[PDB]
Subunit: 78 residues, 6 copies
């Protein structure tokens, strides 16, 4: 769960950012679904869910955790 | 096929954060359920985006994500 | 010239705009959301944190203090 | 799989074929959901599937043809 | 106006064509494949069984007796 | 280069291979098809006309006279 997420964050996370309740994660083209799957499988209590595009993932924070808090957690896992 | 029928077939779970309802579906079903939501033309829904097993439904102010998630849950 | 390409694709592909909070919601013809989102990404707007494309909808996340309504208005006019 | 049979009943709009391919049509957005049930049925004469938005390509395992697969999907429906 | 819209979008979006067996393989800019494939579907060509779009590639399935090469040639002429 | 990067990702992402006629069918973990297909495309193999990625399956289209079977043997060898 968390170990596979941690590994893929190091492999696939290009950058992180945030706005309100959202963490925005950027990946190489095509990698968003694969990294998002790993986040989903980790089932973090402070993550409501994720949605992946092609190179971008929106991670929705569970109140009171903020998007900036999740972005910094992800960032420091790279 | 109508949202009101497909919610019972395709909704795994509902949750919320701020102005977003977060719906989960079985793998691969998100676009199909989200299409039904879009077609429902709900006054309180600004729009939806589907991934593979997750839909984000955007609430129209002042409706909250929790209010929307409650409705989706209740109509399952 | 990311902005010029985005401008012209908005003209071709942007059906409507709407918003809520920190989100602009852009509608496009079926299947076009990824192509328009790519152009928005490439313009690299300071007021945009990122985009997710679905099939006929793009969610554009606004960079604070810009609101969704403010982003939506900008897209609506570049159209 | 009877789970695949029910979703074909529900979501299969039409079938067609060319060569080693069966081409399945679904309502908009439904292709991945139906293809998932096909994959899970693990049919011996199916090598694999790819889903688009409203179309699935189903690859026939030699010597089975696309036509034979399309006929099989028509039947189950 | 399906065939006419399809021709216009091929001019805009078709980067290259190629073939193998019963398939025409169409290449587009990143993200554009679903939108072009939609235009092809809606044209309802008698020599096309169906399309599947990825991100930057479309597979167009030729209806017998038309080969993938004869289909790709048709698209190439509209590039 | 692109072939080296592709080979490394095959080791990580290729669950199985199979073939039919001109097609090689590669299976990946869920969600990984687009990323492995991107690496294959970037490698620009002369044997490969093109790829389409689904969610866990990639269809790799062989450039004639290479067959699907030969393509799959190739990917298997690089894993
Ligand atoms: N090759 C592409 N599809 N590019 C556009 C990606 C648009 C958006 N950032 C997403 O991940 O959904
Ligand atoms: N099989 C997969 N694609 N899994 C990843 C899904 C990631 C995210 N929950 C979404 O639905 O977009
Ligand atoms: N043909 C479809 N996939 N329709 C559903 C679209 C659902 C949602 N508005 C999105 O763009 O992701
Ligand atoms: N713009 C898109 N992602 N279109 C394809 C729809 C998603 C997926 N292939 C499905 O049938 O559910
Ligand atoms: N709304 C759309 N994406 N339509 C285009 C679908 C293109 C192609 N038939 C596929 O299913 O992949
Ligand atoms: N990894 C992804 N699902 N990327 C987005 C695919 C783009 C979409 N199939 C289109 O051509 O418009
Ligand atoms: N950004 C990406 N998803 N790139 C990979 C594209 C893979 C394959 N050519 C397709 O269109 O499905
Ligand atoms: N319903 C969807 N759009 N699913 C996207 C699947 C993930 C992506 N196409 C991949 O190659 O792994
Ligand atoms: N979660 C899913 N989308 N599962 C269905 C995958 C269907 C098909 N094998 C594809 O990769 O396109």
């Amino acid at each position: 769960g968390t170990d596979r997420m941690a590994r893929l964050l190091g492999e696939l996370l290009v950058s992180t950012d945030d706005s309100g309740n959202l963490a925005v994660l950027r990946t190489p083209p095509g990698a968003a679904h694969y990294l998002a799957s790993a986040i989903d499988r980790a089932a973090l209590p402070q993550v409501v869910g994720t949605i992946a595009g092609d190179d971008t993932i929106l991670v929705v924070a569970r109140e009171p955790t903020t998007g900036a808090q999740l972005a910094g957690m992800f960032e420091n896992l790279r």
